[PDB]
Amino acid sequence: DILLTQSPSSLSGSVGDRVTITCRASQGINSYLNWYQQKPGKAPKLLIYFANRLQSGVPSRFSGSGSGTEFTLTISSLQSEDGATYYCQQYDTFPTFGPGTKLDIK
Amino acid sequence: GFLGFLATAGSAMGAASLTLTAQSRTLLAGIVQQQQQLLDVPKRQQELLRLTVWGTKNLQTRVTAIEKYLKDQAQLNAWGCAFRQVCCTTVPWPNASLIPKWNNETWQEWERKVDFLEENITALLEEAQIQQEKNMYELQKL
Amino acid sequence: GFLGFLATAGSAMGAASLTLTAQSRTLLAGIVQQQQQLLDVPKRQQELLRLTVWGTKNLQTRVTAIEKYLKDQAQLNAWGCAFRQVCCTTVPWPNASLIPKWNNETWQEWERKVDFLEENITALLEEAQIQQEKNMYELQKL
Amino acid sequence: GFLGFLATAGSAMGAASLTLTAQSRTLLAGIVQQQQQLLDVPKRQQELLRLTVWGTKNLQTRVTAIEKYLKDQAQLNAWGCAFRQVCCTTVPWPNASLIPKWNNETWQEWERKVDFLEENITALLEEAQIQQEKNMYELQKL
Amino acid sequence: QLQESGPGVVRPSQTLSLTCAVSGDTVSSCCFFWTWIRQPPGKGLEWIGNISYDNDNTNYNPSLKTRISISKDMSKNQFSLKLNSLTATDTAIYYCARESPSRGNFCYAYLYGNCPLHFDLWGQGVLVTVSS
Amino acid sequence: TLYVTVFYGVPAWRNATIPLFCATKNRDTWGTTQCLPDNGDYSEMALNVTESFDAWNNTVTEQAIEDVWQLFETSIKPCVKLSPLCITMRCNKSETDRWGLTKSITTTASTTSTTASAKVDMVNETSSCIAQDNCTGLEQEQMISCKFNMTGLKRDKSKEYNETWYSADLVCEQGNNTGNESRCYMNHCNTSVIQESCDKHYWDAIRFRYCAPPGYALLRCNDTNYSGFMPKCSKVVVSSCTRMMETQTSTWFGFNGTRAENRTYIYWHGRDNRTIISLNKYYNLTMKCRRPGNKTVLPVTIMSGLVFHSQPINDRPKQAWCWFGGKWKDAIKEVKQTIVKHPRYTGTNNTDKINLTAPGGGDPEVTFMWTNCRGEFLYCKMNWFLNWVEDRNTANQKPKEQHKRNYVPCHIRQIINTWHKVGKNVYLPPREGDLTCNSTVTSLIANIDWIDGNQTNITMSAEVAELYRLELGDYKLVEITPIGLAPTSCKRY
Amino acid sequence: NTSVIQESCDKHYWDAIRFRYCAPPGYALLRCNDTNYSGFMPKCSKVVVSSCT
Ligand SMILES: *[C@@H]1O[C@H](CO)[C@@H](O[C@@H]2O[C@H](CO)[C@@H](O[C@@H]3O[C@H](CO[C@H]4O[C@H](CO[C@H]5O[C@H](CO)[C@@H](O)[C@H](O)[C@@H]5O)[C@@H](O)[C@H](O[C@H]5O[C@H](CO)[C@@H](O)[C@H](O)[C@@H]5O[C@H]5O[C@H](CO)[C@@H](O)[C@H](O)[C@@H]5O)[C@@H]4O)[C@@H](O)[C@H](O[C@H]4O[C@H](CO)[C@@H](O)[C@H](O)[C@@H]4O)[C@@H]3O)[C@H](O)[C@H]2NC(C)=O)[C@H](O)[C@H]1NC(C)=O
Ligand SMILES: *[C@@H]1O[C@H](CO)[C@@H](O[C@@H]2O[C@H](CO)[C@@H](O[C@@H]3O[C@H](CO[C@H]4O[C@H](CO[C@H]5O[C@H](CO)[C@@H](O)[C@H](O)[C@@H]5O)[C@@H](O)[C@H](O[C@H]5O[C@H](CO)[C@@H](O)[C@H](O)[C@@H]5O[C@H]5O[C@H](CO)[C@@H](O)[C@H](O)[C@@H]5O)[C@@H]4O)[C@@H](O)[C@H](O[C@H]4O[C@H](CO)[C@@H](O)[C@H](O)[C@@H]4O)[C@@H]3O)[C@H](O)[C@H]2NC(C)=O)[C@H](O)[C@H]1NC(C)=O
Ligand SMILES: *[C@@H]1O[C@H](CO)[C@@H](O[C@@H]2O[C@H](CO)[C@@H](O[C@@H]3O[C@H](CO[C@H]4O[C@H](CO)[C@@H](O)[C@H](O)[C@@H]4O)[C@@H](O)[C@H](O[C@H]4O[C@H](CO)[C@@H](O)[C@H](O)[C@@H]4O[C@H]4O[C@H](CO)[C@@H](O)[C@H](O)[C@@H]4O)[C@@H]3O)[C@H](O)[C@H]2NC(C)=O)[C@H](O)[C@H]1NC(C)=O
Ligand SMILES: *[C@@H]1O[C@H](CO)[C@@H](O[C@@H]2O[C@H](CO)[C@@H](O[C@@H]3O[C@H](CO[C@H]4O[C@H](CO)[C@@H](O)[C@H](O)[C@@H]4O)[C@@H](O)[C@H](O[C@H]4O[C@H](CO)[C@@H](O)[C@H](O)[C@@H]4O)[C@@H]3O)[C@H](O)[C@H]2NC(C)=O)[C@H](O)[C@H]1NC(C)=O
Ligand SMILES: *[C@@H]1O[C@H](CO[C@@H]2O[C@@H](C)[C@@H](O)[C@@H](O)[C@@H]2O)[C@@H](O[C@@H]2O[C@H](CO)[C@@H](O)[C@H](O)[C@H]2NC(C)=O)[C@H](O)[C@H]1NC(C)=O
Ligand SMILES: *[C@@H]1O[C@H](CO[C@@H]2O[C@@H](C)[C@@H](O)[C@@H](O)[C@@H]2O)[C@@H](O[C@@H]2O[C@H](CO)[C@@H](O)[C@H](O)[C@H]2NC(C)=O)[C@H](O)[C@H]1NC(C)=O
Ligand SMILES: *[C@@H]1O[C@H](CO)[C@@H](O[C@@H]2O[C@H](CO)[C@@H](O)[C@H](O)[C@H]2NC(C)=O)[C@H](O)[C@H]1NC(C)=O
Ligand SMILES: *[C@@H]1O[C@H](CO)[C@@H](O[C@@H]2O[C@H](CO)[C@@H](O)[C@H](O)[C@H]2NC(C)=O)[C@H](O)[C@H]1NC(C)=O
Ligand SMILES: *[C@@H]1O[C@H](CO)[C@@H](O)[C@H](O)[C@H]1NC(C)=O
Ligand SMILES: *[C@@H]1O[C@H](CO)[C@@H](O)[C@H](O)[C@H]1NC(C)=O
Ligand SMILES: *[C@@H]1O[C@H](CO)[C@@H](O)[C@H](O)[C@H]1NC(C)=O
Ligand SMILES: *[C@@H]1O[C@H](CO)[C@@H](O)[C@H](O)[C@H]1NC(C)=O
Ligand SMILES: *[C@@H]1O[C@H](CO)[C@@H](O)[C@H](O)[C@H]1NC(C)=O
Ligand SMILES: *[C@@H]1O[C@H](CO)[C@@H](O)[C@H](O)[C@H]1NC(C)=O
Ligand SMILES: *[C@@H]1O[C@H](CO)[C@@H](O)[C@H](O)[C@H]1NC(C)=O
Ligand SMILES: *[C@@H]1O[C@H](CO)[C@@H](O)[C@H](O)[C@H]1NC(C)=O
Ligand SMILES: *[C@@H]1O[C@H](CO)[C@@H](O)[C@H](O)[C@H]1NC(C)=O
Ligand SMILES: *[C@@H]1O[C@H](CO)[C@@H](O)[C@H](O)[C@H]1NC(C)=O
Ligand SMILES: *[C@@H]1O[C@H](CO)[C@@H](O)[C@H](O)[C@H]1NC(C)=O
Ligand SMILES: *[C@@H]1O[C@H](CO)[C@@H](O)[C@H](O)[C@H]1NC(C)=O
Ligand SMILES: *[C@@H]1O[C@H](CO)[C@@H](O)[C@H](O)[C@H]1NC(C)=O
């Protein structure tokens, strides 16, 4: 299978700053990578799909892109409501998910 | 002909099972069937054997079977280890960044990760064989 | 070219005298004479070298000389004993009902008594060589 | 392709440096470029691949590359020492009147002084190999 | 939309079942998959399996090849898990999702690797504890 | 420590772009000359590999298209040229006026009739209207009896000949003919030279399969989810030769396909909206075409000594026509459903908003169904059929086209602009006697084109070449390259 | 009238045409050198081998 990892595992920034998460893979993913946002006590929701498409209902502050073995999630202006664990999913084959990373709030 | 090469695909590199008789068998099956047809066409059409397109397309396929067989034998003799399986040549592997997972990866997956090394390696393998030959040349002369 | 193969026919299998250079000599005599003619025809007719029938019949004969030489070498390498005379392979003879009179029968008489065995034997000889190669593969790897 | 053979011309026979991979390399460079063109011509002209003169002249050059490679291998196997550099055959040199100045003469100058010996020598070299093969034939049989 | 359900406590060596109801939709709708993932406490998201797939075909995470079974029932608008040979490490929040394809010029087949696929719609999640 | 070493006999491959061998069973003419005999070995091995397949960008399909075309060209090349026939012919004026090649204002026709006249007419095997070639709505074949002066091998002697042309094959000079004997020429002569397709081409079936040369193999995608373009096929099967291909040419529907399965598949171009829809064999869809009458054929020797086959019928037979059998209504409903559920379709999910339609324009090359019946090409007008199979509310399609029938009127055309991208016109000799053909229907060739979530238009297409991409398509040609390199510790001495 | 007559213009039949056949490499011609050879002979005891006719 494809090993999907994430970095930084723990990062933060102030409300209003630019915060990014990078996902990497041991094998190339053609473009088949999704991003999810999970808050405590809740099921995760789709944030971005298929590398470059924002999921309808998700605020415009979220964006991302990627290919091959490197993908990025960007929040252009971190909100106080964005404290969450974010996860990458490769679905190039039998989806395995990455470990997730945490964005805290300052 | 048999296609026993492709038959083990997906088994991983280690224990993949390599067969050295496999190219001789694909060529031999080919030559016999094509020779039978070469003798069969003249039964009805001897004059137009190469004039028209079918005879030049078939010529390219017969030529390819021979040239391909010979390219493998010529490259192997340049390296010198034509019948040595693993060959055990003296050229070092280019870097530690490209080491196969002998028990996880398949030869099909692996070879596509070294396509950019083969261009430099082929020449190095030939050079190593050339120096070994030079050393023996001098021993035989003296 | 020489035809030293046929020259000993009728001498019996034992002491028949086998020659391993004989196919190289028939091919070499052929290639030189045909090459001289390839260069000679253009002196008067360069354009119609393959368009008309004579150039496609001669192509089939030149192709046959090459394909035949290579079929023998390919089959021998599949067996592996290309330059070993008797080869000394490990495949057992099919049955006791077909044993040659080494001092009475000629190779011409004998081979026609085993035409129905060769079909099974060729494959067995190749299989025996393949396993020997597999054993060496593992020794070289480990 | 490389032309490393001609590259050492003028260096004298001794220390001339002989390379055994050199014919494999000239053939391999040739086959790859010609194969690319065989597949490229049909992009615009598939029907007239051999009908017109260019396709018969190119056929003779492709055929020559193969026949030449095989003549060298066939002659070497007739002698038997295909991969032995100096080969160390048992045929005596014809006379003391033709001894090279190993440290003064070039292979180009030397070979032209033995053109009238090669005609007799080639046959003798083959005969010597044939008797060695006969001796081994009998050892393997008995 | 997706409401899961099942016993909060199951024992080791028993079989767990979880059934999810689909509300405002059905389980025979075209080009959707009914899937499940797990989230052991303190861990990330593990995909475990997939069945509307319009067919009886399934895809399972190979680590559970002999342990997990997924089925659907069109008379109930429900789909469910059956997980055998339970152990302590199977404690997790079990979640449902649709894994909807993005149909269009980028989707060739409803297979992994041949179509954009994403879990847009998620259920609530059921925490199942395996204990004595 | 770790040396490159050389591993010989390695199970690995790369994309090949080389010519393939053909092998066949019909060796009466073409097969012996160009092909090897069919070995009959259709077995395959499955491999545990993942591979990328494409039908519209392959070497296997692009040779099938070029090879069928090329074998056609080498068959007609030595046949009689008809430039000696591009002379004014003296044609019966009544028949030129009735079929509209020439004009007349002395016919002053006026018709009064019922406008509420649409009918529904069904035919099947057990019917006298088929046996007698008189189904409701069929007319006469449209043929202009013409005379001309032709010279044979004796040079200074000539004879007048009787030739009956289909109207589709004549031009006819117009203006100030106040008598009889109109002046006509062949439809495609003056811009070019028409050659007769004399060596029985299209009179029988051509079937063959391709075989890889030594060292090469064919991989095939054996999924059910294969839709022409598939970047990662998990079921890869390896063999040395392809399935047997039927080199049939037609528009709108493909006939006698090898890929006839109890399933509807739709292949789409990856970069386009063009598709080939296979039809479900479960419904036994069949087309039965007839050429009523009994033709006489008269060989004419022209100057060079080569022979032209004339058609002195001197009679007035009914139109060639086609009868559609099998469960067409249900097969078409499945096509609509298959499109709705397809991965590449994002249109309407309402099957009553998806319709079959003819391509537009006034160009006969796309608006008529073109089919081959043992050597004669037929061009069918299919409005009656489409209205029937869709159970369409006709209502306002002009009286003649407002019928629902499972048969269509058709006409014979002898001067044919061939199917490949050539612009070459050939003459198809008439067949002596009567003709009947009974073919299976295996595919629907169409583009799917929608712009909104209401109205999808399955537009019938004339791109006959794409039919070869359903026959093959799932194949990939690869080169076995069994030399590998890999770090290991085992250096010689 | 039934055909077209072509002139045999390239001096054909104006001189003698004589040639012999030669076997390609690996092949040979055997000849029956009996006096009892009558065209068909299933067992010729005098067999002679050569490369050309
Ligand atoms: C052995 O044989 C097999 C079988 O044939 C070979 O497999 C085929 O290999 C081809 C390349 O050799 C592949 O095609 C190429 O795909 C590229 C990627 O396409 C996708 O991304 C596009 C844009 O994405 C960018 O950004 C991301 C990150 O955000 C990066 O990762 C990307 O690299 C890019 O920078 C996207 O536009 C594509 O979608 C469009 O094209 C595909 C075509 O497959 C269509 O299916 C889609 O519907 C869509 O179509 C639009 O565009 C076409 C024009 O092509 C119009 O006709 C349509 O109407 C519509 O507008 C994908 O999502 C492409 O970038 C690449 O294109 C560039 O390069 C080619 C030359 O190679 C140029 O001609 C182009 O103009 C352009 O510059 C190309 O399409 C095949 O997909 C692959 N086939 C299969 C089945 O897998 C294999 O390689 C062979 N192997 C060997 C060793 O020989
Ligand atoms: C290398 O090249 C050489 C040189 O060409 C090859 O040698 C030739 O090989 C051929 C076979 O491959 C031989 O021909 C065959 O001979 C068979 C035996 O013929 C005799 O017996 C016939 C009947 O006997 C039956 O009963 C006895 C026991 O009682 C059995 O043992 C037999 O097997 C039978 O069952 C008898 O009729 C024959 O006599 C007739 O035929 C011969 C032809 O040689 C004539 O010479 C005779 O005059 C006589 O002619 C009559 O028939 C012919 C029709 O052929 C008419 O035209 C005449 O007017 C007249 O009526 C013999 O006494 C035959 O059975 C066999 O025929 C069958 O099979 C062939 C196909 O192979 C069919 O086409 C037939 O229709 C029939 O079914 C055939 O004739 C050649 O003799 C032999 N040539 C030489 C010089 O030796 C060699 O094989 C090649 N090797 C390789 C590896 O390629
Ligand atoms: C979709 O698929 C279908 C099914 O395969 C296909 O229909 C069939 O097409 C084939 C090929 O055209 C047809 O086969 C031919 O049929 C004719 C007619 O036979 C009937 O009528 C005669 C009347 O005399 C009866 O005696 C006979 O029993 C049948 O009822 C045959 O004449 C053809 O044979 C000729 O060629 C043979 C070669 O070996 C000769 O030995 C034989 O004597 C025949 O010679 C004639 O034709 C020669 C032309 O080369 C000519 O030179 C001779 O002088 C003489 O005229 C052959 O068997 C088959 O019947 C069709 N079946 C059906 C149900 O339609 C469709 O065509 C295909 N459609 C598309 C679009 O691809
Ligand atoms: C070869 O190819 C043929 C043609 O495709 C296949 O035949 C079809 O097989 C399928 C599967 O068995 C049939 O589908 C089933 O039809 C049943 C009957 O429904 C009738 O009535 C409804 C209205 O109520 C109509 O819409 C329908 O068209 C029929 O007239 C249904 O009761 C079945 O329902 C099941 O699935 C649904 C989900 O869609 C569930 O909700 C139900 O509870 C239930 O489980 C089903 O739809 C189809 O009708 C057959 N077609 C024909 C023409 O006969 C062959 O099977 C195939 N051969 C092989 C070997 O595969
Ligand atoms: C061929 O058709 C007849 C008549 O059926 C009618 O006309 C058809 C052209 C079409 O429009 C049908 O829908 C019409 O119903 C068939 O004969 C009938 O068969 C049914 C049983 O299915 C029977 O109840 C009727 O009484 C029959 N009618 C008559 C006049 O006898 C005939 O079976 C069809 N042939 C085949 C091979 O199916
Ligand atoms: C080949 O002939 C066509 C048609 O022939 C002419 O129109 C017929 C209706 C009839 O009256 C014939 O006797 C005529 O010779 C030519 O097509 C016409 O070209 C003219 C331009 O010169 C154009 O104005 C017309 O509309 C065209 N008519 C049609 C029906 O297409 C065509 O140009 C001729 N080609 C050559 C090389 O001469
Ligand atoms: C194609 O099918 C038709 C039937 O639709 C066949 O024609 C029948 O042939 C039999 C036997 O000669 C006659 O008894 C019937 O009367 C014919 N039916 C009709 C309507 O004429 C035809 O033979 C089949 N195939 C071909 C190639 O002709
Ligand atoms: C096949 O046709 C459809 C319908 O026109 C194309 O779908 C459109 O794609 C564009 C992007 O290129 C979108 O902005 C439109 O909204 C889509 N239209 C509809 C109705 O959904 C489709 O791209 C075409 N396929 C190819 C390969 O070109
Ligand atoms: C290939 O797949 C089959 C199941 O279809 C499996 O039994 C076999 O072990 C697999 N082989 C390899 C090398 O993965
Ligand atoms: C070193 O390894 C990288 C892979 O990380 C590869 O791209 C590069 O070509 C290698 N360099 C050499 C000399 O082999
Ligand atoms: C194969 O993958 C496993 C992880 O699943 C790893 O532990 C093992 O070392 C890998 N094998 C090789 C040869 O690298
Ligand atoms: C061949 O026949 C000759 C007589 O003509 C005889 O002297 C010779 O020994 C025979 N050779 C063999 C091998 O039988
Ligand atoms: C056994 O000997 C007979 C000869 O009597 C032969 O026909 C048969 O093919 C032989 N069987 C095997 C297996 O060699
Ligand atoms: C040769 O034949 C004789 C009988 O004449 C026999 O005694 C002898 O054993 C046979 N030779 C062989 C090798 O079988
Ligand atoms: C060839 O000539 C150059 C001078 O141009 C000289 O330096 C070199 O040593 C010469 N080599 C031989 C083999 O004579
Ligand atoms: C002996 O040497 C002379 C050169 O002086 C040469 O022409 C002749 O061919 C040689 N003879 C032999 C048998 O080599
Ligand atoms: C080279 O020539 C010199 C004379 O200039 C001579 O003394 C020497 O022996 C010659 N070398 C050889 C190998 O004969
Ligand atoms: C077909 O694929 C090849 C790559 O294998 C690409 O270079 C070529 O441009 C493609 N052809 C088309 C239809 O664009
Ligand atoms: C044409 O046919 C009629 C019979 O309908 C006959 O009288 C006339 O002579 C024929 N004309 C020619 C030129 O063959
Ligand atoms: C017909 O005749 C009139 C004169 O009465 C002339 O003006 C007209 O151009 C002629 N038309 C044709 C087509 O010849
Ligand atoms: C019809 O043709 C005849 C000659 O066969 C001629 O006499 C007659 O006048 C023509 N009809 C008309 C209206 O010109």
Side-chain angles (χ1 to χ4, degrees), chain E residues 105, chain F residues 268-273 344 346 448-453:
Chain E
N105 61 304
Chain F
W268 291 61
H269 199 344
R271 59 187 195 93
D272 206 338
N273 265 268
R344 292 172 64 82
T346 58
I448 301 170
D449 189 356
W450 71 100
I451 62 170
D452 205 335

Side-chain angles (χ1 to χ4, degrees), chain A residues 15-87:
Chain A
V15 174
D17 287 336
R18 181 179 181 271
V19 179
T20 62
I21 300 169
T22 301
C23 294
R24 302 297 304 274
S26 67
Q27 299 183 35
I29 297 167
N30 286 341
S31 63
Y32 297 116
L33 184 145
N34 299 323
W35 293 85
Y36 296 84
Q37 182 184 57
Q38 183 176 39
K39 295 184 181 183
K42 297 180 175 67
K45 67 180 185 181
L46 182 66
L47 191 66
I48 299 173
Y49 66 92
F50 187 52
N52 293 277
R53 276 77 176 175
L54 188 66
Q55 174 65 22
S56 297
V58 176
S60 65
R61 67 181 179 272
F62 291 96
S63 68
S65 69
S67 70
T69 57
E70 181 174 351
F71 296 77
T72 301
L73 172 67
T74 301
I75 303 173
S76 67
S77 178
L78 184 70
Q79 300 300 304
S80 66
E81 296 180 2
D82 288 320
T85 299
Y86 294 79
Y87 300 90

